[PDB]
Amino acid sequence: NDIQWCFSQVKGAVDDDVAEADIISTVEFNHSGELLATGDKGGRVVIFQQEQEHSRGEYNVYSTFQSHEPEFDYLKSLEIEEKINKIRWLPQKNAAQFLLSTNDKTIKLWKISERDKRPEGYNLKEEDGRYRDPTTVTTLRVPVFRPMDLMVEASPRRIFANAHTYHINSISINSDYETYLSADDLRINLWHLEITDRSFNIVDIKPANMEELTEVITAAEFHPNSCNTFVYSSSKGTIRLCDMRASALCDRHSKLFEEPEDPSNRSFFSEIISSISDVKFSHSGRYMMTRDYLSVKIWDLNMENRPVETYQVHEYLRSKLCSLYENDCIFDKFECCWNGSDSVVMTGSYNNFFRMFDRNTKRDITLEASRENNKPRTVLKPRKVCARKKDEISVDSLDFNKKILHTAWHPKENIIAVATTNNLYIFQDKV
């Protein structure tokens, strides 16, 4: 039945000192699954490598670097944050690894490589310990290579900057191994992975009169297989699927996915809670999952009028919408992810809770990412929230400062990474 999730690892400070710069803002596995990268608010990217001797090894620190630095836009006299918005791994070209890291304005291509040898031997001097007198040398010696302890290097290969007027919210690589897209609030640009001085603006929904603004782009993503298909979601709860074969500019959407507005549950907040914060293509590519504030919707790419599935993440927050609006919690941008076989979907919630939904069995579980269970191979108890029986949690006792916004699934195994405000938890199943 349900997967027996167990505590495996925790990475971060043992205290509650968030420091506001160590807060994780993105979690991502690579294509093989052995590497796990996290970016934080301070602009740092940390890569953990699975211990290789199916594979249930632990993750240890593999690399660390400063992806982005704080900047100042003199052109607008505004502080440009170094917070890492998205990290996307590229398919493995050679022995090195590559990723794309984006802040609000700039995308960077980073190469992570291992070096295990160094040059040895000198002509005009010794090994930097002393210099040699001129004319003393009468025999050339070409430097040789000698092994050294393995050390990991991270270097920025290409910078894609100054192309987005607004804050970038999405980057997505194309299946052709050649291009990718970056999407800010109102425009989607297409980049070539080896060209930094120009980009192709494929989508532009900026109105002529800015006081007539009604929609913004909240997420965008390429199809996992099809090289011509991509989707982008908006703050109105609609997803536009664009085909790049029809025309050079994708201003005319091929498909429009939107559910009819239910007049039953109308409220003052129905416009805010209907905004889509994340859209993810299934691994098979035949389904599409969108996350709004209160629910997770699964759409068949052949049916546009309604989703095929709808799961309610946290229904007990429906009566507490005003309170969540007062403290700006209603504007949180949660995420969602599929499993390897597109059968289970995982998303986050409040009070360090994350939700698993099984599509085959229609069973949902709530689990807690807490350090109080800091014992490896310990089964996580399911959690229940009461609107108070035994082992239940009252709604008014939930901590809304503890949000699980970023989660990742291992592309092949049953390993999940869950980012709380300051710690990163890695959970495995009972194997």
């Binding site: 800015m210 006081e211 603004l213 913004v216």
Partner: peptide, 13 residues
């Protein structure tokens, strides 16, 4: 809603 999360889009120096 066009004020709290929007902000920077509508805000122009």
């Amino acid at each position: 809603y066009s004020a709290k999360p929007y902000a920077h889009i509508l805000s122009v120096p």
